Design a protein around this nucleic acid. Structure first.
Ligand SMILES: CN[C@@H]1[C@H](O[C@H]2[C@H](O[C@H]3[C@H](O)[C@@H](O)[C@H](NC(=N)N)[C@@H](O)[C@@H]3NC(=N)N)O[C@@H](C)[C@]2(O)C=O)O[C@@H](CO)[C@H](O)[C@H]1O
Ligand SMILES: [K+]
Ligand SMILES: [K+]
Ligand SMILES: [K+]
Ligand SMILES: [K+]
Ligand SMILES: [Mg+2]
Ligand SMILES: [Mg+2]
Ligand SMILES: [Mg+2]
Ligand SMILES: [Mg+2]
Ligand SMILES: [Mg+2]
Ligand SMILES: [Mg+2]
Ligand SMILES: [Mg+2]
Ligand SMILES: [Mg+2]
Ligand SMILES: [Mg+2]
Ligand SMILES: [Mg+2]
Ligand SMILES: [Mg+2]
Ligand SMILES: [Mg+2]
Ligand SMILES: [Mg+2]
Ligand SMILES: [Mg+2]
Ligand SMILES: [Mg+2]
Ligand SMILES: [Mg+2]
Ligand SMILES: [Mg+2]
Ligand SMILES: [Mg+2]
Ligand SMILES: [Mg+2]
Ligand SMILES: [Mg+2]
Ligand SMILES: [Mg+2]
Ligand SMILES: [Mg+2]
Ligand SMILES: [Mg+2]
Ligand SMILES: [Mg+2]
Lengths: 208, 117, 132, 62
RNA sequence: GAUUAACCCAAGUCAAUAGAAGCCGGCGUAAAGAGUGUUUUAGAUCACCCCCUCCCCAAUAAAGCUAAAACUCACCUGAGUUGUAAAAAACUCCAGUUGACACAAAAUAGACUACGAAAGUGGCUUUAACAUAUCUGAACACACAAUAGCUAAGACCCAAACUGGGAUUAGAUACCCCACUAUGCUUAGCCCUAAACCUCAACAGUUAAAUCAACAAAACUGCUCGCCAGAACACUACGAGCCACAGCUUAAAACUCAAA
RNA sequence: AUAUACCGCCAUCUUCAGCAAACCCUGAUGAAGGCUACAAAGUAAGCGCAAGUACCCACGUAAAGACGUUAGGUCAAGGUGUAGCCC
């Protein structure tokens, strides 16, 4: 790294600084003065202070990119968001008067919730006991399950079963199926849940 | 009351048969052993058994077993903090017995002398 | 391991010179150059002909002043001129030094068609930088 | 606090790392106590840029 | 090997052979304290003076007894039990509860350190009972001696060489699983061995001096008995003796090496 | 021909820190060994490391990286010891 340890990561939150001094707690107040002395890294290009910035939709874009082609990864994401948006408007005009109150049209709310329905609760971790490795069920951390949800969605879409379907139409179709707790990505979570509940006899090998 | 050592080891004055056959001389050392890593206690197992029993009944649906999952989730969070707190605090915090590294600095100030000078 | 232009460590009875005590990675940081011409500058030519003259001049002086050279030669070029600067021991008589100066200057001026001048700097004994 | 390499110049004596730490432990102990004015001078001997952006001068055009 | 020079002896030289110089040292691990105890002929000076752990804790022999577990049988219930790193085979009058029930073996105590010559001895009771008023004293006399094993007659819970089956493996005459026998137990005879090793003889005494190769369990003195003198051949061969007949005890040499 | 005579230039452990002269002490003056910071026999030039330097800084990357190890590589870079060929 070209940055020294002294350099600290920057805080892009715009409503944090605005906080009145009267609200500042004694601990928080101290921090603010301390940062003045510290050196701050230059903010990276990826994250701004806009009101539309979504860390989950930016991380999902980075996990699809190939060879640094971010203009194409971002393009696919926005097309997918627009495809989810246009498909729900088509399901909203053709619905009954009382069915329109339960139809979500915001593509973000669908993206975040669909990924939350794929997050597994427990996983299989190899533990060394008696000179052997056992795939014991272990509670996946918050980050791990958030990462797996994204990886599985991108693997399923990349999988070459759909002969000639564009990613935006594939990713949009999988996101709407997981929103209703359907599809393979959800099924893939159950298959990991069926192997952690069959091998529960080895749930004492772990210590932490 | 430390057990006796009269007429225990094979010697010249002792007429009777030996009682003890030590492979290492019975002479105090100037250091103690390092505390051995234990095994640990698995946590959130009861929350993990009632959450996987609900999936079988409900065919692994996360909409009917929501309450059970939180027990297993909230527990993991609390258990994770305890592990971090325990490791750091025990070494830094002074409770009960001392640690070998600090206890061997005390035994090396008062070394055992099995020789004459 | 790297060996080039390095004097390996010894008990301490081996005397080395400043130039002999520094390895190649100090040639422009703690050392200069023994030859200074323009051949190797960007856009200059005749770098291979100034080099052959240096290899021969260092051998001509080593065999023409045997046992008298304390340190390496410092060859300098200014236009047509070529300046040889040397550090020599005081063991040899001055009469013989003047003979070798007029013989080497003249011989090398007719061989390389250029004015050659030689500047001796006698020293009592080989200057020692440190003992490796 | 005076660094090890700078403390061997005041004393002209080679010092180990451990000896330097021992000396620093006594100076810190000295500071915690209610040291007199003279002591502050003694400790000071062994002790050795505002992070503000430089504003550009506002100019005026024709 | 030849040649040159040199060294030693010298009318001799010096290859083979033989002989001449061999005991006051040792025995925890180098070769040596030979499983134990007693005595004899005798030797010693530790025997008179002169003095200090009788008795009791797991000695021995005999007879009797039984708490825990097990086997077996019976009832009731169940449909499996065994086995494990994981399997197979095996068993299915099997398994679990309850109850009745040993010629086997003796948790804790025992962090004790005792008895006995040693071997060895650790459940209860009772009887008999544990040499010697100097020491030493035997491969063979006299008497003992773990385990294993033989012969004969009984017993049988469990374990278990052999054997059979199952598996592993390149193979597996093994390690792992199962089953079962000789055997371990009792009575009566025999056999007579051990890393029978606390590898450190018995008695008496000392803690000073040079402490003392090393390691181990500090180093010595007196006295006596026993044993041992390079390695291997050799816990062999022959001979003798023995209830021992594929045995035990005692126990060489030749060939061979220059080390062990 | 010989890299198993070598110089020379390297590899490697080294994405190390150790190498070592000269002394001293211990062990009864044996081969050997040599630390404890509330300090108990070690001190140490030199070498390397480090620091400096280069590149866009203090960062990072280069470079440097010993003494030894593997009779490591190369007699076909060149030179060279030894033995050999010379119609
Ligand atoms: C000091 N000499 C040591 C000794 O060498 C000995 C060694 O002697 C060997 C005999 O010839 C052989 O018949 C003898 N073979 C037998 N079957 N007895 C070897 O055992 C014997 N080696 C030995 N005892 N270590 O070989 C011989 C040729 C030797 O060099 C004679 O001096 O033994 C050698 C190892 O055997 C060592 O390497 C040598 O250093
Ligand atoms: K023994
Ligand atoms: K080489
Ligand atoms: K060559
Ligand atoms: K050659
Ligand atoms: Mg032992
Ligand atoms: Mg012996
Ligand atoms: Mg004996
Ligand atoms: Mg015997
Ligand atoms: Mg009992
Ligand atoms: Mg007697
Ligand atoms: Mg006899
Ligand atoms: Mg015998
Ligand atoms: Mg017997
Ligand atoms: Mg029998
Ligand atoms: Mg049986
Ligand atoms: Mg078989
Ligand atoms: Mg039987
Ligand atoms: Mg015994
Ligand atoms: Mg005797
Ligand atoms: Mg012999
Ligand atoms: Mg025998
Ligand atoms: Mg025999
Ligand atoms: Mg016979
Ligand atoms: Mg080589
Ligand atoms: Mg080679
Ligand atoms: Mg750098
Ligand atoms: Mg490099
Ligand atoms: Mg460097």
């Amino acid at each position: 790294s070209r940055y020294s340890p002294e350099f600290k990561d920057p805080l892009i939150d715009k409503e944090y600084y605005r906080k009145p001094v009267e609200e500042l707690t004694e601990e928080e107040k101290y921090v603010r003065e301390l940062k003045k002395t510290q050196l701050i890294k230059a903010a990276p290009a990826g994250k701004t202070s806009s009101v539309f910035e979504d860390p989950v939709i930016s991380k999902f874009t980075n996990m699809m990119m190939i060879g640094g082609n971010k203009v194409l990864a971002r393009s696919l994401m926005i097309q997918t968001l627009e495809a989810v948006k246009r498909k729900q408007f088509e399901k909203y005009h053709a619905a009954s008067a009382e069915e329109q109150a339960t139809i979500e049209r915001n593509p973000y709310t669908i993206f975040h919730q669909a990924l939350k329905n794929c997050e597994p609760m427990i996983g299989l971790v190899p533990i060394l006991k008696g000179g052997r490795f056992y795939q014991v069920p272990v509670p996946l951390p918050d980050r791990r399950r958030r990462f797996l949800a994204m990886k599985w969605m991108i693997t399923e879409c990349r999988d070459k079963k759909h002969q000639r379907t564009l990613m935006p139409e594939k990713l949009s179709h999988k996101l709407l199926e997981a929103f209703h707790n359907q599809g393979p990505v959800i099924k893939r979570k159950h298959d990991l849940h069926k192997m952690a509940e069959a091998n529960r006899a080895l749930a004492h090998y772990r210590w932490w | 009351a430390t057990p006796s050592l009269r007429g225990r080891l094979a010697r010249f004055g002792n007429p009777r048969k030996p009682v003890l056959k030590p492979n290492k001389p019975l002479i105090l050392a100037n250091r103690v052993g390092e505390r051995r890593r234990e095994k640990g206690e698995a946590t959130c197992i009861t929350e993990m058994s009632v959450m996987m029993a609900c999936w079988k009944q409900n065919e692994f649906r996360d909409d009917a077993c929501r309450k059970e999952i939180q027990g297993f989730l909230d527990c993991a969070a609390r258990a994770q903090e305890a592990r971090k707190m325990r490791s750091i605090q025990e070494t830094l915090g002074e409770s009960g017995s001392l640690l070998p590294n600090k206890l061997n600095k005390l035994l090396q100030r008062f070394p055992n002398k099995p020789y004459l000078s | 391991k790297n060996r080039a232009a390095r004097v390996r460590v010894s008990k301490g009875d081996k005397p080395v010179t400043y130039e002999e005590a520094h390895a190649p990675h100090y040639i422009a940081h703690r050392k200069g150059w023994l030859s200074l011409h323009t051949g190797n500058l960007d856009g200059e030519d005749h770098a291979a002909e100034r080099t052959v003259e240096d290899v021969f001049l260092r051998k001509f002086m080593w065999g023409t002043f045997p046992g008298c050279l304390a340190d390496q030669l410092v060859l300098k070029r200014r236009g047509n001129q070529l300046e040889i600067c040397a550090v020599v021991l005081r063991q040899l008589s001055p009469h013989k030094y003047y003979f070798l100066v007029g013989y080497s200057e003249t011989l090398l001026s007719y061989f390389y068609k250029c004015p050659v001048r030689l500047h001796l700097q006698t020293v009592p004994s080989k200057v020692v930088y440190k003992y490796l | 606090w005076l660094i090890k390499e700078e403390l061997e110049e005041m004393l002209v004596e080679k010092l180990s790392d451990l000896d330097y730490m021992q000396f620093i432990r006594l100076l810190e102990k000295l500071l915690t106590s209610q040291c007199g004015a003279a002591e502050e001078e003694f400790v000071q001997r062994f002790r050795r840029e505002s992070k503000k952006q430089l504003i550009e001068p506002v100019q005026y055009d024709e």
